[PDB]
JSON list of N, CA and C in Angstrom, two decimals:
[
{"chain": "A", "resi": 1, "resn": "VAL", "atom": "N", "xyz": [0.88, -1.27, 0.08]},
{"chain": "A", "resi": 1, "resn": "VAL", "atom": "CA", "xyz": [-0.47, -0.29, 0.16]},
{"chain": "A", "resi": 1, "resn": "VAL", "atom": "C", "xyz": [0.83, 1.25, 0.26]},
{"chain": "A", "resi": 2, "resn": "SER", "atom": "N", "xyz": [-0.03, 2.54, -0.86]},
{"chain": "A", "resi": 2, "resn": "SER", "atom": "CA", "xyz": [0.87, 3.73, -1.03]},
{"chain": "A", "resi": 2, "resn": "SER", "atom": "C", "xyz": [1.03, 4.47, 0.72]},
{"chain": "A", "resi": 3, "resn": "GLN", "atom": "N", "xyz": [0.77, 3.63, 1.75]},
{"chain": "A", "resi": 3, "resn": "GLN", "atom": "CA", "xyz": [0.28, 3.92, 3.00]},
{"chain": "A", "resi": 3, "resn": "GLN", "atom": "C", "xyz": [2.66, 4.59, 3.93]},
{"chain": "A", "resi": 4, "resn": "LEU", "atom": "N", "xyz": [3.15, 3.24, 3.51]},
{"chain": "A", "resi": 4, "resn": "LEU", "atom": "CA", "xyz": [4.03, 3.25, 3.56]},
{"chain": "A", "resi": 4, "resn": "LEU", "atom": "C", "xyz": [5.35, 3.90, 2.52]},
{"chain": "A", "resi": 5, "resn": "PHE", "atom": "N", "xyz": [4.93, 3.86, 1.51]},
{"chain": "A", "resi": 5, "resn": "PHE", "atom": "CA", "xyz": [5.12, 5.47, 0.32]},
{"chain": "A", "resi": 5, "resn": "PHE", "atom": "C", "xyz": [5.06, 6.36, 1.03]},
{"chain": "A", "resi": 6, "resn": "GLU", "atom": "N", "xyz": [3.74, 6.67, 1.36]},
{"chain": "A", "resi": 6, "resn": "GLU", "atom": "CA", "xyz": [3.78, 8.76, 2.05]},
{"chain": "A", "resi": 6, "resn": "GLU", "atom": "C", "xyz": [4.78, 8.62, 2.81]},
{"chain": "A", "resi": 7, "resn": "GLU", "atom": "N", "xyz": [5.04, 7.21, 3.69]},
{"chain": "A", "resi": 7, "resn": "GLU", "atom": "CA", "xyz": [6.39, 7.49, 4.91]},
{"chain": "A", "resi": 7, "resn": "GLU", "atom": "C", "xyz": [7.35, 8.26, 4.36]},
{"chain": "A", "resi": 8, "resn": "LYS", "atom": "N", "xyz": [7.83, 6.84, 3.74]},
{"chain": "A", "resi": 8, "resn": "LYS", "atom": "CA", "xyz": [9.92, 7.09, 2.97]},
{"chain": "A", "resi": 8, "resn": "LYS", "atom": "C", "xyz": [9.73, 8.40, 1.63]},
{"chain": "A", "resi": 9, "resn": "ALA", "atom": "N", "xyz": [9.10, 8.51, 1.17]},
{"chain": "A", "resi": 9, "resn": "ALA", "atom": "CA", "xyz": [9.08, 8.78, -0.36]},
{"chain": "A", "resi": 9, "resn": "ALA", "atom": "C", "xyz": [8.98, 10.88, 0.07]},
{"chain": "A", "resi": 10, "resn": "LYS", "atom": "N", "xyz": [8.00, 11.02, 1.52]},
{"chain": "A", "resi": 10, "resn": "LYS", "atom": "CA", "xyz": [8.36, 12.16, 2.01]},
{"chain": "A", "resi": 10, "resn": "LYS", "atom": "C", "xyz": [9.36, 12.36, 2.76]},
{"chain": "A", "resi": 11, "resn": "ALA", "atom": "N", "xyz": [10.06, 12.03, 2.97]},
{"chain": "A", "resi": 11, "resn": "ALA", "atom": "CA", "xyz": [11.55, 11.80, 3.48]},
{"chain": "A", "resi": 11, "resn": "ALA", "atom": "C", "xyz": [12.25, 11.81, 2.30]},
{"chain": "A", "resi": 12, "resn": "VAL", "atom": "N", "xyz": [12.79, 11.18, 1.39]},
{"chain": "A", "resi": 12, "resn": "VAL", "atom": "CA", "xyz": [13.69, 11.21, 0.43]},
{"chain": "A", "resi": 12, "resn": "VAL", "atom": "C", "xyz": [13.68, 12.34, -0.48]},
{"chain": "A", "resi": 13, "resn": "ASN", "atom": "N", "xyz": [12.19, 13.17, -0.77]},
{"chain": "A", "resi": 13, "resn": "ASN", "atom": "CA", "xyz": [12.36, 14.72, -1.34]},
{"chain": "A", "resi": 13, "resn": "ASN", "atom": "C", "xyz": [13.02, 15.46, -0.32]},
{"chain": "A", "resi": 14, "resn": "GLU", "atom": "N", "xyz": [13.40, 14.84, 0.93]},
{"chain": "A", "resi": 14, "resn": "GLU", "atom": "CA", "xyz": [13.70, 16.19, 1.62]},
{"chain": "A", "resi": 14, "resn": "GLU", "atom": "C", "xyz": [14.92, 16.18, 2.46]},
{"chain": "A", "resi": 15, "resn": "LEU", "atom": "N", "xyz": [15.54, 14.95, 2.48]},
{"chain": "A", "resi": 15, "resn": "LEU", "atom": "CA", "xyz": [16.72, 14.24, 3.37]},
{"chain": "A", "resi": 15, "resn": "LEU", "atom": "C", "xyz": [18.00, 15.11, 3.27]},
{"chain": "A", "resi": 16, "resn": "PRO", "atom": "N", "xyz": [18.71, 15.32, 4.02]},
{"chain": "A", "resi": 16, "resn": "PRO", "atom": "CA", "xyz": [19.57, 15.94, 4.08]},
{"chain": "A", "resi": 16, "resn": "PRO", "atom": "C", "xyz": [20.72, 15.87, 3.44]},
{"chain": "A", "resi": 17, "resn": "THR", "atom": "N", "xyz": [20.64, 14.64, 2.42]},
{"chain": "A", "resi": 17, "resn": "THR", "atom": "CA", "xyz": [21.69, 13.53, 1.64]},
{"chain": "A", "resi": 17, "resn": "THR", "atom": "C", "xyz": [20.59, 13.78, 0.67]},
{"chain": "A", "resi": 18, "resn": "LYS", "atom": "N", "xyz": [20.28, 14.78, 0.02]},
{"chain": "A", "resi": 18, "resn": "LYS", "atom": "CA", "xyz": [19.66, 14.28, -1.22]},
{"chain": "A", "resi": 18, "resn": "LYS", "atom": "C", "xyz": [19.54, 13.92, -2.05]},
{"chain": "A", "resi": 19, "resn": "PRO", "atom": "N", "xyz": [17.93, 13.19, -2.84]},
{"chain": "A", "resi": 19, "resn": "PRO", "atom": "CA", "xyz": [18.95, 11.64, -4.01]},
{"chain": "A", "resi": 19, "resn": "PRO", "atom": "C", "xyz": [19.45, 12.19, -4.77]},
{"chain": "A", "resi": 20, "resn": "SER", "atom": "N", "xyz": [20.95, 11.46, -5.21]},
{"chain": "A", "resi": 20, "resn": "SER", "atom": "CA", "xyz": [21.58, 11.52, -6.25]},
{"chain": "A", "resi": 20, "resn": "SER", "atom": "C", "xyz": [20.86, 11.32, -7.81]},
{"chain": "A", "resi": 21, "resn": "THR", "atom": "N", "xyz": [21.84, 11.85, -8.22]},
{"chain": "A", "resi": 21, "resn": "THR", "atom": "CA", "xyz": [21.16, 12.32, -9.90]},
{"chain": "A", "resi": 21, "resn": "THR", "atom": "C", "xyz": [20.70, 11.19, -10.90]},
{"chain": "A", "resi": 22, "resn": "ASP", "atom": "N", "xyz": [20.87, 9.92, -11.21]},
{"chain": "A", "resi": 22, "resn": "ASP", "atom": "CA", "xyz": [20.42, 9.25, -11.69]},
{"chain": "A", "resi": 22, "resn": "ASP", "atom": "C", "xyz": [18.65, 8.28, -11.21]},
{"chain": "A", "resi": 23, "resn": "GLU", "atom": "N", "xyz": [19.25, 9.08, -9.61]},
{"chain": "A", "resi": 23, "resn": "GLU", "atom": "CA", "xyz": [18.51, 7.80, -8.91]},
{"chain": "A", "resi": 23, "resn": "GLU", "atom": "C", "xyz": [17.35, 8.86, -8.63]},
{"chain": "A", "resi": 24, "resn": "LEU", "atom": "N", "xyz": [17.62, 10.16, -8.60]},
{"chain": "A", "resi": 24, "resn": "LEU", "atom": "CA", "xyz": [16.38, 11.26, -8.85]},
{"chain": "A", "resi": 24, "resn": "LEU", "atom": "C", "xyz": [15.30, 11.10, -9.76]},
{"chain": "A", "resi": 25, "resn": "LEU", "atom": "N", "xyz": [15.66, 10.40, -11.48]},
{"chain": "A", "resi": 25, "resn": "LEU", "atom": "CA", "xyz": [14.76, 10.32, -12.37]},
{"chain": "A", "resi": 25, "resn": "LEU", "atom": "C", "xyz": [13.75, 9.32, -11.93]},
{"chain": "A", "resi": 26, "resn": "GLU", "atom": "N", "xyz": [14.23, 8.08, -11.05]},
{"chain": "A", "resi": 26, "resn": "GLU", "atom": "CA", "xyz": [13.72, 6.74, -10.86]},
{"chain": "A", "resi": 26, "resn": "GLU", "atom": "C", "xyz": [12.78, 7.31, -9.31]},
{"chain": "A", "resi": 27, "resn": "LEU", "atom": "N", "xyz": [13.14, 7.64, -8.61]},
{"chain": "A", "resi": 27, "resn": "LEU", "atom": "CA", "xyz": [12.60, 8.56, -7.63]},
{"chain": "A", "resi": 27, "resn": "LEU", "atom": "C", "xyz": [11.19, 9.10, -8.39]},
{"chain": "A", "resi": 28, "resn": "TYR", "atom": "N", "xyz": [11.53, 10.41, -8.50]},
{"chain": "A", "resi": 28, "resn": "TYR", "atom": "CA", "xyz": [10.96, 11.01, -9.01]},
{"chain": "A", "resi": 28, "resn": "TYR", "atom": "C", "xyz": [9.42, 10.32, -10.14]},
{"chain": "A", "resi": 29, "resn": "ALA", "atom": "N", "xyz": [9.72, 9.84, -11.07]},
{"chain": "A", "resi": 29, "resn": "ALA", "atom": "CA", "xyz": [9.02, 8.62, -12.29]},
{"chain": "A", "resi": 29, "resn": "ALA", "atom": "C", "xyz": [8.39, 7.96, -10.55]},
{"chain": "A", "resi": 30, "resn": "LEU", "atom": "N", "xyz": [8.37, 6.92, -10.15]},
{"chain": "A", "resi": 30, "resn": "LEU", "atom": "CA", "xyz": [7.73, 6.37, -8.84]},
{"chain": "A", "resi": 30, "resn": "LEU", "atom": "C", "xyz": [7.08, 7.43, -7.84]},
{"chain": "A", "resi": 31, "resn": "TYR", "atom": "N", "xyz": [7.50, 8.64, -7.34]},
{"chain": "A", "resi": 31, "resn": "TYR", "atom": "CA", "xyz": [6.96, 9.05, -6.33]},
{"chain": "A", "resi": 31, "resn": "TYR", "atom": "C", "xyz": [5.76, 9.92, -7.00]},
{"chain": "A", "resi": 32, "resn": "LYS", "atom": "N", "xyz": [6.26, 10.67, -8.14]},
{"chain": "A", "resi": 32, "resn": "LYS", "atom": "CA", "xyz": [5.01, 10.99, -9.13]},
{"chain": "A", "resi": 32, "resn": "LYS", "atom": "C", "xyz": [3.97, 9.84, -8.91]},
{"chain": "A", "resi": 33, "resn": "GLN", "atom": "N", "xyz": [4.44, 8.76, -9.67]},
{"chain": "A", "resi": 33, "resn": "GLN", "atom": "CA", "xyz": [3.68, 7.67, -9.71]},
{"chain": "A", "resi": 33, "resn": "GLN", "atom": "C", "xyz": [2.13, 7.44, -8.78]},
{"chain": "A", "resi": 34, "resn": "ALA", "atom": "N", "xyz": [2.81, 7.21, -7.62]},
{"chain": "A", "resi": 34, "resn": "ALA", "atom": "CA", "xyz": [2.03, 6.73, -6.67]},
{"chain": "A", "resi": 34, "resn": "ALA", "atom": "C", "xyz": [1.16, 8.19, -5.45]},
{"chain": "A", "resi": 35, "resn": "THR", "atom": "N", "xyz": [2.05, 9.03, -6.34]},
{"chain": "A", "resi": 35, "resn": "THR", "atom": "CA", "xyz": [1.68, 10.51, -4.89]},
{"chain": "A", "resi": 35, "resn": "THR", "atom": "C", "xyz": [0.44, 10.67, -6.65]},
{"chain": "A", "resi": 36, "resn": "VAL", "atom": "N", "xyz": [0.29, 11.43, -7.48]},
{"chain": "A", "resi": 36, "resn": "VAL", "atom": "CA", "xyz": [-1.07, 12.04, -7.85]},
{"chain": "A", "resi": 36, "resn": "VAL", "atom": "C", "xyz": [-1.84, 10.63, -8.58]},
{"chain": "A", "resi": 37, "resn": "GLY", "atom": "N", "xyz": [-1.11, 9.49, -9.27]},
{"chain": "A", "resi": 37, "resn": "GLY", "atom": "CA", "xyz": [-2.13, 8.09, -9.02]},
{"chain": "A", "resi": 37, "resn": "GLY", "atom": "C", "xyz": [-2.43, 8.48, -10.45]},
{"chain": "A", "resi": 38, "resn": "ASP", "atom": "N", "xyz": [-1.60, 8.94, -11.38]},
{"chain": "A", "resi": 38, "resn": "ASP", "atom": "CA", "xyz": [-2.18, 8.96, -12.69]},
{"chain": "A", "resi": 38, "resn": "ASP", "atom": "C", "xyz": [-1.20, 9.73, -12.94]},
{"chain": "A", "resi": 39, "resn": "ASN", "atom": "N", "xyz": [-0.98, 9.22, -14.78]},
{"chain": "A", "resi": 39, "resn": "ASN", "atom": "CA", "xyz": [-0.50, 11.29, -15.85]},
{"chain": "A", "resi": 39, "resn": "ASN", "atom": "C", "xyz": [-1.11, 12.59, -15.28]},
{"chain": "A", "resi": 40, "resn": "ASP", "atom": "N", "xyz": [-0.66, 13.52, -15.04]},
{"chain": "A", "resi": 40, "resn": "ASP", "atom": "CA", "xyz": [-1.25, 14.50, -14.41]},
{"chain": "A", "resi": 40, "resn": "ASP", "atom": "C", "xyz": [-1.01, 15.39, -15.36]},
{"chain": "A", "resi": 41, "resn": "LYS", "atom": "N", "xyz": [0.30, 16.41, -15.04]},
{"chain": "A", "resi": 41, "resn": "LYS", "atom": "CA", "xyz": [1.19, 17.71, -15.77]},
{"chain": "A", "resi": 41, "resn": "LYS", "atom": "C", "xyz": [1.28, 17.42, -16.53]},
{"chain": "A", "resi": 42, "resn": "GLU", "atom": "N", "xyz": [0.61, 16.88, -18.03]},
{"chain": "A", "resi": 42, "resn": "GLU", "atom": "CA", "xyz": [1.05, 16.49, -19.36]},
{"chain": "A", "resi": 42, "resn": "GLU", "atom": "C", "xyz": [1.32, 18.23, -19.75]},
{"chain": "A", "resi": 43, "resn": "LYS", "atom": "N", "xyz": [2.39, 18.90, -19.27]},
{"chain": "A", "resi": 43, "resn": "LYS", "atom": "CA", "xyz": [3.49, 19.63, -19.81]},
{"chain": "A", "resi": 43, "resn": "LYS", "atom": "C", "xyz": [4.27, 20.17, -18.89]},
{"chain": "A", "resi": 44, "resn": "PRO", "atom": "N", "xyz": [5.74, 19.19, -19.37]},
{"chain": "A", "resi": 44, "resn": "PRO", "atom": "CA", "xyz": [6.82, 19.34, -18.53]},
{"chain": "A", "resi": 44, "resn": "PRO", "atom": "C", "xyz": [7.48, 20.51, -19.93]},
{"chain": "A", "resi": 45, "resn": "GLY", "atom": "N", "xyz": [8.20, 21.39, -19.36]},
{"chain": "A", "resi": 45, "resn": "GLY", "atom": "CA", "xyz": [8.72, 22.76, -20.01]},
{"chain": "A", "resi": 45, "resn": "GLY", "atom": "C", "xyz": [8.77, 22.98, -21.54]},
{"chain": "A", "resi": 46, "resn": "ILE", "atom": "N", "xyz": [9.57, 23.90, -21.75]},
{"chain": "A", "resi": 46, "resn": "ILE", "atom": "CA", "xyz": [10.18, 23.85, -22.96]},
{"chain": "A", "resi": 46, "resn": "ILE", "atom": "C", "xyz": [11.49, 23.88, -23.03]},
{"chain": "A", "resi": 47, "resn": "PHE", "atom": "N", "xyz": [12.68, 24.31, -22.54]},
{"chain": "A", "resi": 47, "resn": "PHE", "atom": "CA", "xyz": [13.31, 23.97, -22.36]},
{"chain": "A", "resi": 47, "resn": "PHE", "atom": "C", "xyz": [13.84, 23.50, -21.72]},
{"chain": "A", "resi": 48, "resn": "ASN", "atom": "N", "xyz": [12.86, 22.38, -20.73]},
{"chain": "A", "resi": 48, "resn": "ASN", "atom": "CA", "xyz": [12.80, 21.69, -20.11]},
{"chain": "A", "resi": 48, "resn": "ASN", "atom": "C", "xyz": [13.10, 20.67, -19.55]},
{"chain": "A", "resi": 49, "resn": "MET", "atom": "N", "xyz": [14.80, 20.37, -20.46]},
{"chain": "A", "resi": 49, "resn": "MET", "atom": "CA", "xyz": [14.77, 18.71, -21.10]},
{"chain": "A", "resi": 49, "resn": "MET", "atom": "C", "xyz": [14.50, 18.38, -20.07]},
{"chain": "A", "resi": 50, "resn": "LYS", "atom": "N", "xyz": [15.20, 18.37, -18.76]},
{"chain": "A", "resi": 50, "resn": "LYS", "atom": "CA", "xyz": [15.11, 17.61, -17.74]},
{"chain": "A", "resi": 50, "resn": "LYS", "atom": "C", "xyz": [14.13, 17.61, -16.96]},
{"chain": "A", "resi": 51, "resn": "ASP", "atom": "N", "xyz": [13.35, 17.91, -16.76]},
{"chain": "A", "resi": 51, "resn": "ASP", "atom": "CA", "xyz": [11.96, 17.66, -17.06]},
{"chain": "A", "resi": 51, "resn": "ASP", "atom": "C", "xyz": [11.14, 16.88, -17.10]},
{"chain": "A", "resi": 52, "resn": "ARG", "atom": "N", "xyz": [11.45, 16.59, -19.11]},
{"chain": "A", "resi": 52, "resn": "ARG", "atom": "CA", "xyz": [11.05, 16.22, -19.94]},
{"chain": "A", "resi": 52, "resn": "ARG", "atom": "C", "xyz": [11.40, 14.46, -19.99]},
{"chain": "A", "resi": 53, "resn": "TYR", "atom": "N", "xyz": [12.68, 14.35, -19.58]},
{"chain": "A", "resi": 53, "resn": "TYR", "atom": "CA", "xyz": [13.29, 13.41, -19.27]},
{"chain": "A", "resi": 53, "resn": "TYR", "atom": "C", "xyz": [12.15, 12.49, -18.19]},
{"chain": "A", "resi": 54, "resn": "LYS", "atom": "N", "xyz": [12.16, 13.12, -16.82]},
{"chain": "A", "resi": 54, "resn": "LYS", "atom": "CA", "xyz": [11.44, 12.91, -16.01]},
{"chain": "A", "resi": 54, "resn": "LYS", "atom": "C", "xyz": [10.39, 12.82, -15.86]},
{"chain": "A", "resi": 55, "resn": "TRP", "atom": "N", "xyz": [9.59, 13.33, -16.82]},
{"chain": "A", "resi": 55, "resn": "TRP", "atom": "CA", "xyz": [8.12, 13.07, -17.49]},
{"chain": "A", "resi": 55, "resn": "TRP", "atom": "C", "xyz": [7.95, 12.05, -18.23]},
{"chain": "A", "resi": 56, "resn": "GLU", "atom": "N", "xyz": [8.29, 11.75, -19.01]},
{"chain": "A", "resi": 56, "resn": "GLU", "atom": "CA", "xyz": [9.10, 10.54, -19.87]},
{"chain": "A", "resi": 56, "resn": "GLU", "atom": "C", "xyz": [8.60, 9.25, -19.08]},
{"chain": "A", "resi": 57, "resn": "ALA", "atom": "N", "xyz": [9.82, 9.33, -18.21]},
{"chain": "A", "resi": 57, "resn": "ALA", "atom": "CA", "xyz": [10.63, 7.72, -17.48]},
{"chain": "A", "resi": 57, "resn": "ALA", "atom": "C", "xyz": [8.98, 7.82, -16.53]},
{"chain": "A", "resi": 58, "resn": "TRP", "atom": "N", "xyz": [8.09, 8.36, -16.37]},
{"chain": "A", "resi": 58, "resn": "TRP", "atom": "CA", "xyz": [6.87, 9.08, -15.69]},
{"chain": "A", "resi": 58, "resn": "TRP", "atom": "C", "xyz": [5.95, 8.73, -16.36]},
{"chain": "A", "resi": 59, "resn": "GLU", "atom": "N", "xyz": [5.71, 8.72, -17.32]},
{"chain": "A", "resi": 59, "resn": "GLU", "atom": "CA", "xyz": [4.24, 8.05, -18.07]},
{"chain": "A", "resi": 59, "resn": "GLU", "atom": "C", "xyz": [4.42, 7.06, -18.64]},
{"chain": "A", "resi": 60, "resn": "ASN", "atom": "N", "xyz": [6.01, 6.45, -18.74]},
{"chain": "A", "resi": 60, "resn": "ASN", "atom": "CA", "xyz": [5.57, 5.21, -18.86]},
{"chain": "A", "resi": 60, "resn": "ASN", "atom": "C", "xyz": [5.04, 4.21, -18.03]},
{"chain": "A", "resi": 61, "resn": "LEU", "atom": "N", "xyz": [4.46, 4.53, -16.75]},
{"chain": "A", "resi": 61, "resn": "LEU", "atom": "CA", "xyz": [2.84, 4.03, -15.86]},
{"chain": "A", "resi": 61, "resn": "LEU", "atom": "C", "xyz": [2.50, 5.00, -16.21]},
{"chain": "A", "resi": 62, "resn": "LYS", "atom": "N", "xyz": [2.11, 5.50, -16.72]},
{"chain": "A", "resi": 62, "resn": "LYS", "atom": "CA", "xyz": [0.61, 6.80, -16.34]},
{"chain": "A", "resi": 62, "resn": "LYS", "atom": "C", "xyz": [-0.42, 6.12, -16.23]},
{"chain": "A", "resi": 63, "resn": "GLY", "atom": "N", "xyz": [-1.13, 4.94, -16.14]},
{"chain": "A", "resi": 63, "resn": "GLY", "atom": "CA", "xyz": [-2.26, 4.39, -15.41]},
{"chain": "A", "resi": 63, "resn": "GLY", "atom": "C", "xyz": [-2.01, 3.69, -14.51]},
{"chain": "A", "resi": 64, "resn": "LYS", "atom": "N", "xyz": [-1.43, 2.54, -14.48]},
{"chain": "A", "resi": 64, "resn": "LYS", "atom": "CA", "xyz": [-1.12, 1.41, -13.57]},
{"chain": "A", "resi": 64, "resn": "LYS", "atom": "C", "xyz": [-0.37, 1.96, -11.97]},
{"chain": "A", "resi": 65, "resn": "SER", "atom": "N", "xyz": [0.27, 3.19, -12.31]},
{"chain": "A", "resi": 65, "resn": "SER", "atom": "CA", "xyz": [1.09, 4.17, -11.58]},
{"chain": "A", "resi": 65, "resn": "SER", "atom": "C", "xyz": [0.79, 4.41, -10.41]},
{"chain": "A", "resi": 66, "resn": "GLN", "atom": "N", "xyz": [-0.10, 3.91, -9.72]},
{"chain": "A", "resi": 66, "resn": "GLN", "atom": "CA", "xyz": [-0.34, 3.91, -7.87]},
{"chain": "A", "resi": 66, "resn": "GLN", "atom": "C", "xyz": [-0.17, 2.62, -7.70]},
{"chain": "A", "resi": 67, "resn": "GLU", "atom": "N", "xyz": [-0.40, 1.64, -8.21]},
{"chain": "A", "resi": 67, "resn": "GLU", "atom": "CA", "xyz": [-0.34, 0.24, -8.00]},
{"chain": "A", "resi": 67, "resn": "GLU", "atom": "C", "xyz": [0.81, -0.59, -8.08]},
{"chain": "A", "resi": 68, "resn": "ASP", "atom": "N", "xyz": [1.97, -0.50, -8.64]},
{"chain": "A", "resi": 68, "resn": "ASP", "atom": "CA", "xyz": [3.30, -0.46, -9.15]},
{"chain": "A", "resi": 68, "resn": "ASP", "atom": "C", "xyz": [4.33, -0.26, -8.46]},
{"chain": "A", "resi": 69, "resn": "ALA", "atom": "N", "xyz": [4.20, 1.56, -8.02]},
{"chain": "A", "resi": 69, "resn": "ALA", "atom": "CA", "xyz": [4.54, 2.39, -7.45]},
{"chain": "A", "resi": 69, "resn": "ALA", "atom": "C", "xyz": [5.01, 2.00, -6.07]},
{"chain": "A", "resi": 70, "resn": "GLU", "atom": "N", "xyz": [3.89, 2.15, -5.15]},
{"chain": "A", "resi": 70, "resn": "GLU", "atom": "CA", "xyz": [3.42, 1.90, -3.83]},
{"chain": "A", "resi": 70, "resn": "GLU", "atom": "C", "xyz": [4.47, 0.59, -3.62]},
{"chain": "A", "resi": 71, "resn": "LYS", "atom": "N", "xyz": [4.54, -0.85, -4.35]},
{"chain": "A", "resi": 71, "resn": "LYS", "atom": "CA", "xyz": [5.63, -1.45, -4.24]},
{"chain": "A", "resi": 71, "resn": "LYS", "atom": "C", "xyz": [6.61, -2.32, -4.33]},
{"chain": "A", "resi": 72, "resn": "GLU", "atom": "N", "xyz": [6.71, -1.35, -5.26]},
{"chain": "A", "resi": 72, "resn": "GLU", "atom": "CA", "xyz": [8.39, -0.72, -6.04]},
{"chain": "A", "resi": 72, "resn": "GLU", "atom": "C", "xyz": [8.95, 0.03, -5.27]},
{"chain": "A", "resi": 73, "resn": "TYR", "atom": "N", "xyz": [8.35, 0.98, -4.70]},
{"chain": "A", "resi": 73, "resn": "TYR", "atom": "CA", "xyz": [8.34, 2.15, -4.11]},
{"chain": "A", "resi": 73, "resn": "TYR", "atom": "C", "xyz": [9.84, 1.63, -2.54]},
{"chain": "A", "resi": 74, "resn": "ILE", "atom": "N", "xyz": [8.90, 1.43, -1.63]},
{"chain": "A", "resi": 74, "resn": "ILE", "atom": "CA", "xyz": [9.58, 0.83, -0.40]},
{"chain": "A", "resi": 74, "resn": "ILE", "atom": "C", "xyz": [11.22, -0.07, -0.79]},
{"chain": "A", "resi": 75, "resn": "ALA", "atom": "N", "xyz": [11.14, -0.81, -1.69]},
{"chain": "A", "resi": 75, "resn": "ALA", "atom": "CA", "xyz": [12.10, -1.39, -2.07]},
{"chain": "A", "resi": 75, "resn": "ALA", "atom": "C", "xyz": [13.44, -0.88, -2.71]},
{"chain": "A", "resi": 76, "resn": "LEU", "atom": "N", "xyz": [13.37, 1.04, -3.01]},
{"chain": "A", "resi": 76, "resn": "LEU", "atom": "CA", "xyz": [14.20, 1.42, -4.23]},
{"chain": "A", "resi": 76, "resn": "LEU", "atom": "C", "xyz": [14.40, 2.15, -2.29]},
{"chain": "A", "resi": 77, "resn": "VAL", "atom": "N", "xyz": [13.70, 2.79, -1.63]},
{"chain": "A", "resi": 77, "resn": "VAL", "atom": "CA", "xyz": [13.66, 3.90, -0.69]},
{"chain": "A", "resi": 77, "resn": "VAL", "atom": "C", "xyz": [14.75, 3.12, 0.36]},
{"chain": "A", "resi": 78, "resn": "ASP", "atom": "N", "xyz": [14.02, 2.20, 0.80]},
{"chain": "A", "resi": 78, "resn": "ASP", "atom": "CA", "xyz": [14.85, 1.80, 1.74]},
{"chain": "A", "resi": 78, "resn": "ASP", "atom": "C", "xyz": [16.41, 2.12, 1.63]},
{"chain": "A", "resi": 79, "resn": "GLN", "atom": "N", "xyz": [16.74, 1.33, 0.59]},
{"chain": "A", "resi": 79, "resn": "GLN", "atom": "CA", "xyz": [17.94, 1.51, 0.16]},
{"chain": "A", "resi": 79, "resn": "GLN", "atom": "C", "xyz": [18.84, 2.30, 0.01]},
{"chain": "A", "resi": 80, "resn": "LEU", "atom": "N", "xyz": [17.91, 3.39, -0.20]},
{"chain": "A", "resi": 80, "resn": "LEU", "atom": "CA", "xyz": [18.30, 5.31, -0.47]},
{"chain": "A", "resi": 80, "resn": "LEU", "atom": "C", "xyz": [18.58, 5.44, 0.88]},
{"chain": "A", "resi": 81, "resn": "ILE", "atom": "N", "xyz": [17.42, 5.47, 1.81]},
{"chain": "A", "resi": 81, "resn": "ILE", "atom": "CA", "xyz": [17.31, 6.01, 3.23]},
{"chain": "A", "resi": 81, "resn": "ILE", "atom": "C", "xyz": [19.04, 5.94, 3.90]},
{"chain": "A", "resi": 82, "resn": "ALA", "atom": "N", "xyz": [18.88, 4.46, 2.98]},
{"chain": "A", "resi": 82, "resn": "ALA", "atom": "CA", "xyz": [20.72, 3.04, 3.30]},
{"chain": "A", "resi": 82, "resn": "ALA", "atom": "C", "xyz": [22.46, 4.30, 3.33]},
{"chain": "A", "resi": 83, "resn": "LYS", "atom": "N", "xyz": [22.02, 5.41, 2.56]},
{"chain": "A", "resi": 83, "resn": "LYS", "atom": "CA", "xyz": [22.68, 6.31, 2.02]},
{"chain": "A", "resi": 83, "resn": "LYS", "atom": "C", "xyz": [22.76, 7.41, 1.91]},
{"chain": "A", "resi": 84, "resn": "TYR", "atom": "N", "xyz": [21.28, 7.62, 1.92]},
{"chain": "A", "resi": 84, "resn": "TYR", "atom": "CA", "xyz": [20.60, 9.61, 2.58]},
{"chain": "A", "resi": 84, "resn": "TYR", "atom": "C", "xyz": [20.68, 9.46, 3.84]},
{"chain": "A", "resi": 85, "resn": "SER", "atom": "N", "xyz": [20.05, 9.27, 5.18]},
{"chain": "A", "resi": 85, "resn": "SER", "atom": "CA", "xyz": [19.97, 9.26, 6.13]},
{"chain": "A", "resi": 85, "resn": "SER", "atom": "C", "xyz": [21.05, 10.49, 6.76]},
{"chain": "A", "resi": 86, "resn": "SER", "atom": "N", "xyz": [21.82, 9.79, 7.17]},
{"chain": "A", "resi": 86, "resn": "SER", "atom": "CA", "xyz": [23.19, 10.80, 7.38]},
{"chain": "A", "resi": 86, "resn": "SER", "atom": "C", "xyz": [24.45, 10.66, 6.99]}
]
């Protein structure tokens, strides 16, 4: 369930060891996935090549998002908090 998702995800977004560059993409994709639950903001910006890549990796899971995110998410963020706690 998405309960533990919002336990863990809300930490990694604002941890003092903020998420690393290639890990951030996965964490965006999956965080945005279970957070809003659908493809939501279908306009990442114009020069926004970063957001366009992240949003594409998100749109990959556009419909089923919530359900796959919540189960994958725990096993991402626990090994991330292991790096990122302090």
